[PDB]
Amino acid sequence: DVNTLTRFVMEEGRKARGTGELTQLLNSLCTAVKAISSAVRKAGIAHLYGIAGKLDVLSNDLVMNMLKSSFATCVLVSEEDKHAIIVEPEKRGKYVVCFDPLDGSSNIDCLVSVGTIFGIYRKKSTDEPSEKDALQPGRNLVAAGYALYGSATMLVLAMDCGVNCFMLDPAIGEFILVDKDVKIKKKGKIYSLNEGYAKDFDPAVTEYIQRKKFPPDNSAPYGARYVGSMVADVHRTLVYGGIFLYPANKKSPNGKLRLLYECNPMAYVMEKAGGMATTGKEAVLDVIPTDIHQRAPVILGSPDDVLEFLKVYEKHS
Amino acid sequence: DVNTLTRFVMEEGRKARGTGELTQLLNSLCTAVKAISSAVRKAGIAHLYGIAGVKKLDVLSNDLVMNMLKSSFATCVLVSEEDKHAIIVEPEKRGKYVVCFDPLDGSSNIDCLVSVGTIFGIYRKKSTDEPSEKDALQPGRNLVAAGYALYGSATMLVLAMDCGVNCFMLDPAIGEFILVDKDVKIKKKGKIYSLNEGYAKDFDPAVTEYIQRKKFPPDNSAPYGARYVGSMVADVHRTLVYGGIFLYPANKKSPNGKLRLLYECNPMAYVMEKAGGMATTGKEAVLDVIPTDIHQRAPVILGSPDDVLEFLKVYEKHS
Amino acid sequence: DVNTLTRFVMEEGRKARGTGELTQLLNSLCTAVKAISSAVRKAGIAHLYGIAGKLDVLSNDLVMNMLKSSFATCVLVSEEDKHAIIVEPEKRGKYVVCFDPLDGSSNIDCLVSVGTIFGIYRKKSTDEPSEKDALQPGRNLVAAGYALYGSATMLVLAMDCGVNCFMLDPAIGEFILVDKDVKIKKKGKIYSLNEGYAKDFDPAVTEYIQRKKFPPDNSAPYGARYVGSMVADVHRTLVYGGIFLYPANKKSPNGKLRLLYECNPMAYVMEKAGGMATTGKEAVLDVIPTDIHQRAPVILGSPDDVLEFLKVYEKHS
């Protein structure tokens, strides 16, 4: 049987006997993703070049407005906004959404894959909403995922029931369920990180990478891929197995990627798919944030690969 | 004033006072590129998943380019990554051009929605003999036009001719390629290197040393960043837009590289040179290699001239 | 605030505190209508013409399959199917849907506007589902409407809350709320019927049309429009007012249009918009059917114009 994103979400919502607030949340977000996708693929650019005589701001506005008007949110945290947005009282719902509206857009000049990342938490207080409602560990995530604007557009949605992948059919504007209850391979054959900054590596990362290229047990060398767009590399890791690293070093002891709207959603997708996600010191989902824009190191992917990196990390005390 | 690919090609054709065969050629390729883009973005996939109650993308892509080029009446010999032998166009549809193309490069990893692309190179048939596979064995210096479509976050067609390199963005709402970047030039020197460092144990010593100099510069300057998509069109386009260097070099297991000379290396080498970049195998210019086999491989190092020159200096230190 | 069809229906569903089944049905129909519009506009026609070396059947399959897989239906009546379709037990829901998957498609060779018409009933007995469950008067409709595939694609949805019009945005595949709680004019200036068959007219139809062209007083004669496609003529009647007639005569004493999936849904839309719909003898919505494909005469539109027609009709009785 064919299934769509909206029908899938409604059926899971009905099973859970929920009120519908989360469904309204996701349906609005799905609409914003379709509008982002259309602009990313440059529909209407002929009018910009005068046929009749920005993108990351629009993406933020599309997500902000669709979530606000959904009546399911009260606090919105965005890569694009210095402070958390508080939904106006008459529009308030019970959910907090942290999102990166258009990740990778710094390099969109070369048409690199880009994506939208989102994580959804339930509000913690019964009081007036505040930024504190966004300062939850990832363990409390109710749902998370991302849209990948790659050769085609795909939305990956992770919840308690697992991870499901939906392909956007642009002919009809519907996300089609194409991969159900996906699980990452136990062990992959690809590592992904910016090796150009090797001069700064932590000793453990230097050693772990050394083992991928010159395996001690005669086994085959790993291949290397690094798009430089986090959603594209994390999605490749999910589909093919392997490991993705944006680790801590001396110049960046807490990493570069953002915990609330990059690290935590991807870790949740990974764990629901049977993978792992560590900062080196602890599971990503266990870091308790004190700032909405704080950074975290991240190593994630196939469990045998993350376990192997953690073994090397532990050897270096 | 707005410009489109078709309007661009016609006006250049009129300047040159040609017969129109090349314009008919490029317009047919353009049409195939839009149909490939439409299929790559998965338009209509809901029907494959039973919305009402089936071919492979690289086979469909090859059929699109083949049929549009045959039906243009502008071609006589067609070389495709997908066909062991050259296709010789039937007599009533024959024109004067030879086209080498990779209909969907990078589709090996299309399971992960990696950027993919179409690569093409266009030659004038040179002899009066009957057309045969031999007419495709010209060095890249003989290219009349070349370029690629990149199906990335957006679809873009990059067209290189003697007048320079021009970039056209596909507007999907109207199906037109809009000229968005005119006469593009690559930076003299970049800050990105691009290759599969996972296979370092097999590197040529010159490659090992050069990568060493990028990560640990002797002159203390900032280390280069590293990017490698694993899809040639995406990595080369980033090299063209941001500068730097792309390497797919020879080693002892692969003394002739892995990428194919006729429909991957030569078209990309040609685009790079028309943008003021460089493309070498280490031993010679990519465009000067005289091929003997239409599917033969070639090592390729390309990009910003200063970065490729620095590779050649290290490569020379290793004789 | 922007609104979509799915978001609108969800909000009305939560207001009514229903189970979610009707929302699941309408979301399924909406996906089907987007697929029909895409095919009607000839997406992919290049492949049928050899670039790489049915419409009403496809339309029927899209609606049947999306409704079946919705888990919201038990009996489906279609213009295309001789007998009612009974949904298999594992997919049965509580609604009966009568529909015309592609009305007007006989003349689609000239690219005339075409459309999809639907009507939704609640199954009334606990018996095994059967064709008899579709033989309810239109008064029993829970929801009805039509998709018009015209210069643009529009979904008109009528429920107890009134009539609402949604425009399909093809760039994102969403039905956008553009006209809320629409009402038809009290009196129009257009009449619509096939005047080519005047030799067969009932005397009352002949007299009423003669008065529209030759008014007894000084007022302006009505203009005439007849597309020949029911959804287009009825929709123009909705937007501009006036009267649409496909009446009974001696050769066709029960009319030509079908009651279940053409007359009743349109009659329902008209009455929720403040209009009227009569067979001449009684309201269309009060006819109790005895056959799923039975015909009914229909005269509909602005109430003053239908009342004026009934006055002439009664003069000849």
Next chain:
Amino acid sequence: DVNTLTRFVMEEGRKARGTGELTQLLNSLCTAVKAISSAVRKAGIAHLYGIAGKLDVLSNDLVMNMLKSSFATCVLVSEEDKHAIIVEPEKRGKYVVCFDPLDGSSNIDCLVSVGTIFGIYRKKSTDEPSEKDALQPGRNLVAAGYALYGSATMLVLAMDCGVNCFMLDPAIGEFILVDKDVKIKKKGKIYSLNEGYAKDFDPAVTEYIQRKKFPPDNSAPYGARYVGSMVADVHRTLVYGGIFLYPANKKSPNGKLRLLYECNPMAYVMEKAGGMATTGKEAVLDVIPTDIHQRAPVILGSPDDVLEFLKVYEKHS
């Protein structure tokens, strides 16, 4: 072999060994038509209704800017413009284009079919370009035709080589040739006119319509169709045969449709398809215009039907 609009025009152009100017014009016109088609279908309407927080004018701007920038035109007459537009000196070419950028858009509130109509002349005088260069009879047309934005978008192009029909495939933005060297039926079975003006009809029109409804020779009466959008009514006349009439009435004693960019292009298409187009007094294409927006009565379509009307017209002197 598959064929497209651009490839067809290039191939016919090379056959004639022309310079390419007309091809550049028609290619520019095709580009504007696809943009008009996308706008008519409401692409991007979601942004007008706040998803992120004038059609006939846009249509005219698209055609004007695309034709000016083609370097193939020198004088442009548009339904939207009071005076002929004189192309600036550096962009002037040898062609004059009369066009209706969005015909029927008055009633687009009901999503009625609309269309673009065009006629193309070679400039005939050696004077400086002026409004007078647009005043040639339709006999002088080099090319003409129309785009119909109906259930699908279709371009009909008539030249000396005959009439050809191209279907826009919206998935790739290309006009696909689907009907080659089309000919109209010798006699049709549909008549088309606004019968609401019956009180103002000339005796010849009244008699002819009477003959369609009450045939003297026992034959079947014609059916009636009238969309009220000329491109839709004319296109149907071409595809199915029959007759289209817009005669003069009291509001319009010189007729209502405009000679330059409605009557002539359609008359030209009709004659190249083996049909007919008369004012009653003379062939439409032979009328010598004196004013760029002047009106004309028009009767057109299948030749046996237009000849039958002329018989009645001669009977009434």
